[PDB]
Structure 1
């Protein structure tokens, strides 16, 4: 008989839904045949096919027309490096633990993931619909307790790697861009005794996010901002249409009072070397810190984001 190649049968994919049958040469690396290749997040680019690999599914980079279409439609990304960064993160997040704390999926602390835990807890408490099929799929999986893919996707979408220190407000900003916030609208009015008044309408992400004040009530009453003429002007909320709002500000000692907010991010410590915790208002106040939970009737600490429920609001200010 003539000398012949040994092969096995595997599937490749970019979305784990459309599987593509491949015959691989056992004498070559996966990289030699597919380019960068991943097995449940593990980089097997330099590995030759094992007999145990037969029938398994491998993730590859979108390097042909079919895979580019499938990656673009599933992930809503134009970045060729997306699949690689996602799988590199999944290799770690699949090893994290995701305890249920107070009825929510949290993350046990690892790899400086405190900002991810507080973001994950927050996402389970505000009404959000993600546009990428990958995010909406992984999110439901996260609510059921299996958050590893959702966490690796958040890292990919935010261009962060495992172990990098993160920021909740920036994370929320990246994710909100992938959310359907089309019916979200905010109308603001800015009043200066000299220059008069000017109204502004904001839609989408800019209608739900605000930087500089934690108190939604204070935003309704009016916040002092500098105006172009050197006098402090007053900016106040005229109309809001959204299922929630997110008020953020530099970490500052702040009292959280039960029933007046949905949840909040505490940041202790110094700039870019501190620690996030999550505070949620249920029947009392719950402080979720990864796997850890404490309860209290009152809470005061260095708060940096507060989330509030909303539906429709219209000022009574003339």
Structure 2
């Protein structure tokens, strides 16, 4: 006797595709790799409780390929498996509200994710893939499991792997609309003269070398091809925020002079991130943990600043 149930397959969990499955064969034999809200059911035969449920599958026909790319903006064939594998874990994480922001209770080396998530909620940024748009809206409201799983998938990080905040923000910014952002820099060598540069998009909002937005406006010293030390300063800026990054070092954060910052303790390959936000006082959010202080000194790696338009007076 043949028994069947109706299920739906999906790539985006919005558009559903009716399927009738034979209860005597695995999902894998009928769809290929198949997932139920993160759980890999490829090797499992259908259960009666599965009737009417949605399963994620790979894009094995052109309708699914178009749906998958429209929703995720990626054609990496291993994306689904990485997203499903991460979601199995992030579904179990806790997402407390800390000082009005969605954070992440510490688990599985996820401090860099918590810091990035708290930072996103403090800067003006809209994502381009609907998958991130939708999941970020849910994360803002406190249901951040899908957003965190997607970040891990897009960044090619597995749960438990320690990531870098700057690298993660770089990935997230590539999937955001930063097209209006523009940066003009001037590099002044005493041997080689001037050289001005224009940066756009992600490169117009990120800098590596110094944490101070003010010193960037005054000038920082960098190598030259001739062997001398040349001075680089900010000519013009057009963006809603700027990110200043540098190798971790002792740095003093003063209330009211920045938006938020990433603190990193440890070494290159093993450590812990905390988040400092400047509100009515300085709050340090460490996953679910919250402390406050009037002044801050610590190993800072990233600082975020508000911006709209800046023009130098250094002519």
User: 1:84, 1:219 → 2: CA distance?
Assistant: 42
Q: Deviations over 1:164-217 (max 9, x none)?
A: 111000000111000000000000000011111011000001000000100000
Alignment counterpart, residue 208 of structure 2, candidates 194, 207, 211 = 211
The answer on 1:239 being equivalent to 2:232 is no
3-state SS of the aligned residue for 2:86? helix
Asked if the contact 1:219–1:236 (Cα under 8 Å) also holds between the matched residues in 2, the reply is yes
Secondary structure of the structure 2 residue equivalent to 1:200: strand
| Per-residue deviation, 1:230 | 1.1
Secondary structure of 2:299's counterpart equals strand
Q: How big is each residue's C-alpha offset from its partner over 1:242-286, in whole Å with a ceiling of 9 and x where there is no partner?
A: 000000000000000000000000001122211000000000000
Counterpart among 63, 67, 73 of residue 64 in structure 2: 67
1: CA distance between counterparts of 2:244 and 2:301? 8
Q: How many residues align?
A: 315
RMSD of aligned Cα (Å): 0.6
Aligned to 1:58, the other structure's residue is in SS state strand
Whole-Å separation in 1 of the counterparts to 2:286 and 2:63: 43
Cα contact 1:61–1:84 (8 A) shared by 2: no
Residue 59 of structure 1 and its aligned partner are, at CA, apart by 0.7
- SS in structure 1 opposite 2:236? strand
Deviation at 1:153, TM superposition (A): 0.4
TM superposition shift of 1:219 = 0.2
Partner of 1:132: 129
How far the C-alpha of 1:84 sits from its partner, in A, is 1.3
TM-score by length of 1: 0.98
1:181 aligns to what?
Answer: 178
> What is the alpha-carbon distance in structure 1 between the residues aligned to residue 201 and residue 92 of structure 2?
35
State the SS of the aligned residue for 2:173.
helix
Q: Which runs of 4+ in 1 moved over 2 A?
A: none
Determine helix, strand or coil for the equivalent of 1:28.
coil
Q: Provide the rounded CA distance (Å) in 1 between the counterparts of 2:169 and 2:100.
A: 21
